[PDB]
Design a protein around this nucleic acid. Structure first.
Lengths: 187, 62, 142, 258
RNA sequence: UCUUAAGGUAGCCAAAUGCCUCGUCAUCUAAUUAGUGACGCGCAUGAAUGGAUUAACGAGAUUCCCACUGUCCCUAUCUAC
RNA sequence: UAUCUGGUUGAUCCUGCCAGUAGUCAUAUGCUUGUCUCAAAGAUUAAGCCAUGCAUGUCUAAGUAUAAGCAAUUUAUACAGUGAAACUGCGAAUGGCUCAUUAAAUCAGUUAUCGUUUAUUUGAUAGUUCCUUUACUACAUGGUAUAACUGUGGUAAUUCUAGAGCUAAUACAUGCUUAAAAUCUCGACCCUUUGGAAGAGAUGUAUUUAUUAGAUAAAAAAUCAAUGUCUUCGGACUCUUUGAUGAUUCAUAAUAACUUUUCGAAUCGCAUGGCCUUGUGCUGGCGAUGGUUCAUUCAAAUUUCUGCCCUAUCAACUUUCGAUGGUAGGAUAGUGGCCUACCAUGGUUUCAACGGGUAACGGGGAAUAAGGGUUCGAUUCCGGAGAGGGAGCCUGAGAAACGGCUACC
RNA sequence: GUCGGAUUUCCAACGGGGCCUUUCCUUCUGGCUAACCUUGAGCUUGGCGAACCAGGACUUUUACUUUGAAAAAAUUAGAGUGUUCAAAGCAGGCGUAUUGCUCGAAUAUAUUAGCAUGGAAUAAUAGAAUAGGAC
RNA sequence: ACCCACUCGGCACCUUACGAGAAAUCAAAGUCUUUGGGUUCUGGGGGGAGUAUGGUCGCAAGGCUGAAACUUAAAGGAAUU
RNA sequence: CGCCCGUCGCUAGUACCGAUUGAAUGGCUUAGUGAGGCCUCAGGAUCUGCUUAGAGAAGGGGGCAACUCCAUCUCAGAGCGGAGAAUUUGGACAAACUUGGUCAUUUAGAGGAACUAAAAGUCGUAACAAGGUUUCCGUAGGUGAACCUGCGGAAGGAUCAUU
RNA sequence: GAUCCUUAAC
């Protein structure tokens, strides 16, 4: 039943405004999703002019995309590891935009193995020609190799689970990934 | 709801109420033109003053 | 200023990610737009490392409506400053004027180096903050 | 106010309708239609005060139901259908071909057109765009849209519709030296013959127009309506041809033909 | 004017000073010989036999209130000696 | 319609007020009071409370009928005319009343949404609903309860009603119902490198992620790891573009994934010309509806600029612990301290901030008639607001609704 | 001067519009070619492009004043009107009076302020001074 | 140090009225109905009343700010005999 | 033989102060309580769409007498189930009641002290003339009362005047 | 140097 009008707030100088209107419909807000992990459940809430809103709550499996490939796969998420506004959100494992999370991303692991086949650690002519065409690009760098070998990928959720019920996201690649890993290890 | 119906007054009374010269002039005019009350002379004076105001606001320009 | 990433979050222009896979000249890419109406983006804003998601040139805001101008009166609060619009209110009873003024708070991008006693021009835009509704588009001082 | 206003009273209706204050404490509210609430003419006042073809609102609604009055070739069984500028009304009985065109006094007055002009129509293209499936289309002043337009046509041009299909019969480009019709304001009901214009980026471009009497005034872009080239208009004009006669002449005209 | 010289001025008061007297009025209470504020022909107030007031202080005297309670309704039980 | 006179003195000239004078979309009261138009009329005090009666319901040829209601087939054999009732649909958020709160609030003018809905209306917009994809599909088309009526029931009592019997689904879950051009992944080999093909699936928008495109201004040569189009192969390369305003991460198409699937007659009234291998076959128009929507009106929210009465016996105010700004997030139809977390200390003010008063709703307006001005404007129009006081909410596109509910007083 | 009416092969002041005596009155790309060097016999093949229009910009400031949309409709002055004058309110009039025809319902303040627009007189700000000053 | 003249700046004096004013009078109290050089302060009939209250300064006396209820037709200025 | 001042006498009216740790109403506000609607972790009355064996074994087959699938006149037995009224953890909007006060008003109050206005009151004459001590101002003291006196000031003085 | 006062205005 919260409100979103400015008529309840103090003036820029500090003048206390009087009560001129009762709370109105267009200035309503409603309680946050605080979506969690486990046993997906989606609630549909009817808003101004129909416009059904899907409130994520305990959503488990989302969709996540690679940056350089434009390639997205559905995958489960292990749970949030950082959130830029709060640490209590990190602790209670809620999903919000611009939060970095760990994902198993074995869909991406098998995807890379089936696409290029360069193993970590330590046959058909069509596939040989395909690899010859798309070769000389699997020596990008070492951080992505280490992340893939560990098997827990750092992906930032960028959608709003409290509107569309989708913890859709993009993996961290390059500058943002370096920033967040430095942040988590900075102690 | 309804549109108001516009009315207006037709006579403006003289500011000085009792002076011999004006009182006798209006009385003689009414009596010799066969009028019963001063409403006629007041209303025609109001109209004549309206016309003279129009003429003044007209001739004040080139 | 010294550090761009002092924030907890990663400040980046939305929907702009630069592919490191290739190695091309000027590997960093930055996005900007012409606010129009004759104002030109500073050549220092051309290569600057700031983000200012509300900037009229690099951010996502757009300028439309009223173009105002005034002298900055205080510059102690971040990415935004307030100016004095000193005008004369006419009093038809006494046929004379009187000096009134309004402090309109507006937004300054890090591209411009503003100060008190400097003259700036601002443009009406989408509500940026509780009070801010303008961004500076040009500085007339030197 | 908890929802749209559905009524409309006298003293609030637009001036170009000219309703007497008495004989009704409400003013026919135009419905949702093809043209704005103000700069449009509902059929009820046209048929009760502008024509006297039906002397009462019940009668007008009856004749509007029983399919004797059709607008734009379509019957439009709406008791207060808002008929817009340069719209065509075809009354099959008695062959009454009306054009809803602004007179020189700034009102909608009866205008007689023949079969050809009651058949065809003009329109100001309001915005060129491309919609679903990448189809180019344009939206005109009546809100009517047409798809697949010639890419030559741009904003603030004229398009001619044959009334058999939404396809554009002919196009009129907006450029220097073109006869224009201005609808709105104090210039309402005038022919302008645009000559030169200025941009003034930011909004509200104004254009200088000098008519066939070499009288030159200025009006905004949304107010004018380019109707044809020099000389022959692409629609017939009601008496006057949009000239704004000097106020000093109609008294002589009335004293002659009075 | 008389008596012994002057005749109680500022103040203050049923005051630790008032007989009558549990004075009269107001307030506090359900109810008040109590308290406080007023009144004052004050048995018998009163100006360094100091008058009036006064913040702070007080194991000084008095009234009301909040808190608290076996003071009481109305007693009961327990420990040591 | 630029007007003054009486009163201070024994008399005078003055200041000065008192009084007189005239008018009120300013009331009231008294004396009085026949009509032609003519109309204000519980406004001040009491936005106090109400006995009683009414003010929102509604349908066509065309959403659903069997009441055992009315009437008749010389034209339908299953009604097809009204149709009381009841279920669905759209309202009832319009209108009207009052002026309580309200002093940068509202409001007037001016701006903007490049920051935000689309049934209502208008024009147009799905041969991609073959979705374990060639015997799982019936496409001249599959299902589940139920309101009148039937009853032995109710009280000072409700616009109260439950279990029994079948009825209609546009009440609600389902999916096939009318081809591709072209592209990517699957998937036999010439034994080899100028390269694949039989056949399979995928390509509409409705939500989201990530990547693209969406800049032709005058200008010349050479290896590139691999010629990009097709061949005279000293490469001609032309047609490389899809577009406006001040420009956009605009519109818009494209790439890999998205849907727990949001979608595209499983409807009603009106004709029946012709093709025949004479079949409950082959065809075909006029009217409402949701659909992806695109865009136009009816709008609503937020909104830039300026402007509001009397007060200093209100001078400093603003941070419950958001006050100013920033980052990130959530919520909203949307931007935004609208709300949360973190950071710095800011923001307004003698050009009157903050506070108090308002017998203060604002404007278009009314009254003066020299000019200038003064006072009011609840109220016939517009913009707000409220339905006894705040608070909350369902439904609905649109109510914090009161002739709608949920509580307290 | 022409079958109660008025045009001018000049003497008055000029709202005004141009160029000149130091008055420098502001881009490069462009146009059917501009005041056109084209002249074939006095529709005829070659001056400096923004007098109108597209991209690079130099719009440094005001106040003021003159314009042009805008403060909605009644309400204001008012055009017109045998609502008998009328206040009002928009009518109504002309006939072939059995069929028909037609003028009408405009203009100013548009209560402050923003928007483009000619001027720049009246009061400031601004320039180049131990020259990082302009070409 | 005096005398004569000139000048600047002063404290001031005589006459008319150029003017002003109700007059007394005034070289300013003039250049103000032929009304505008700049600017500050104060007043709006006589009382109640410089009172009450709230502030504020003072040791106090008091100072500064400063009402209203109510009452009244005059109170006042300058001159005439 | 004019006017005129103040104190004390009588009547009325007006406001002011005032014990009552006064009262009421209205904000706004620290710490508390808190209906109800709302989102939510839980909760499960109550409604069936699909398949199965253990059945007396009908009625129909190969002998016609035992040896055998079929829908079934049934029930503690397996899931995918999907709708779900009660109730209930956490959380927000948050109506109504206390304890303190910014503060805004309205109002009761024993008494006190003023002011104003009432035909001929008393006591004295303070000012108006040099008003009989010129008057006035500020300040301080005194005093039945006007008022008197000290100090400084003013002329609005009773002097525009002593080369 | 006592010469203090004058039933109430018109």
């Amino acid at each position: 039943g919260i409100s979103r009008d400015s008529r309840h707030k103090r003036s820029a100088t500090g003048a206390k405004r009087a009560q001129f209107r009762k709370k109105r419909k267009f200035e309503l807000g409603r309680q946050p999703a605080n979506t969690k992990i486990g046993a997906k459940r989606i609630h549909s809430v009817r808003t101004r002019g129909g416009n059904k809103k899907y409130r994520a709550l305990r959503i488990e499996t989302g969709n996540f995309s690679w940056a350089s490939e434009g390639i997205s796969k559905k995958t489960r998420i292990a749970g949030v590891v950082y959130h830029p506004s709060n640490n209590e959100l990190v602790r209670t494992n809620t999903l919000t935009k611009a939060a970095i999370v760990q994902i198993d991303a074995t869909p991406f692991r098998q995807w890379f193995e089936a696409h290029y086949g360069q193993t970590l650690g330590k046959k058909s002519k069509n596939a040989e020609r395909k690899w010859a065409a798309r070769a000389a690009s699997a020596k990008i760098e070492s951080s992505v190799e280490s992340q893939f070998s560990a098997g827990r990928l750092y992906a930032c959720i960028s959608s709003r689970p409290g509107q569309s019920g989708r913890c859709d996201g993009y993996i961290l690649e390059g500058e943002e990934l370096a920033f967040y890993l430095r942040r988590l290890t900075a102690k | 709801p309804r549109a108001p119906r516009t009315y207006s007054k037709t006579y403006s009374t003289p500011k000085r109420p009792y002076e011999s010269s004006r009182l006798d002039a209006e009385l003689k005019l009414a009596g010799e033109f066969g009028l019963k009350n001063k409403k006629e002379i007041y209303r025609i004076s109001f109209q004549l003053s309206k016309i003279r105001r129009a003429a003044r606001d007209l001739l004040t320009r080139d | 200023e010294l550090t761009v990433q002092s924030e907890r979050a990663f400040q980046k222009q939305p929907h702009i990610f630069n592919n490191p896979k290739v190695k091309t000249s000027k590997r960093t890419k930055r996005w900007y737009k012409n606010a129009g109406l004759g104002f030109k983006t500073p050549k220092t804003a051309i290569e600057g490392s700031y983000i200012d998601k509300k900037c009229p040139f690099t951010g996502l805001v757009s300028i439309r409506g009223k173009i105002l101008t005034g002298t900055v009166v205080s510059t102690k609060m971040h990415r935004t400053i307030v100016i004095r619009r000193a005008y004369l209110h006419y009093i038809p009873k006494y046929n004379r004027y009187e000096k009134r003024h309004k402090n309109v708070p507006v937004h300054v991008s890090p591209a411009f180096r503003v100060q008190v006693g400097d003259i700036v021009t601002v443009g009406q835009c989408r509500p940026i903050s509780k009070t801010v509704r303008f961004n500076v588009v040009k500085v007339s001082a030197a | 106010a908890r929802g749209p206003k559905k009524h409309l009273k006298r003293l609030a209706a637009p001036h170009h309708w000219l309703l007497d204050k008495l004989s009704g404490c409400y003013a026919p509210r135009p419905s949702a239609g093809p043209h704005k609430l103000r700069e449009s003419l509902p059929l009820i006042v046209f048929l009760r005060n502008r024509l006297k073809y039906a002397l009462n609102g019940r009668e007008v609604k009856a004749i509007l139901m029983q399919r004797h009055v059709k607008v734009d070739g379509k019957v439009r069984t709406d008791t207060t259908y808002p008929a817009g500028f340069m719209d065509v009304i075809t009354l099959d009985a008695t062959n009454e071909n009306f054009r809803l065109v602004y007179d020189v006094k700034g009102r909608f007055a009866v205008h007689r057109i023949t079969d050809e002009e009651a058949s065809y129509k003009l329109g100001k293209v309001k915005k060129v765009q491309l919609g679903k499936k990448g189809v180019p289309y344009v939206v005109t002043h009546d809100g009517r849209t047409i798809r697949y337009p010639d890419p030559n046509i741009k904003v603030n041009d004229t398009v001619k519709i044959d009334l058999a299909s939404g396809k554009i019969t002919d196009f009129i480009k907006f450029d220097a030296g073109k006869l224009v019709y201005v609808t709105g304001g104090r210039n309402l009901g005038r022919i302008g013959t645009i000559v030169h214009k200025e941009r003034h980026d930011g909004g509200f471009d104004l254009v200088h127009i000098k008519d066939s009497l070499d009288n030159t005034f200025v009006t905004r872009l949304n107010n004018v309506f380019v109707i044809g080239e020099q000389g022959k208009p692409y629609i017939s004009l009601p008496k006057g041809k949009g000239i704004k006669l000097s106020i000093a002449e109609e008294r002589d005209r009335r004293r002659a033909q009075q």
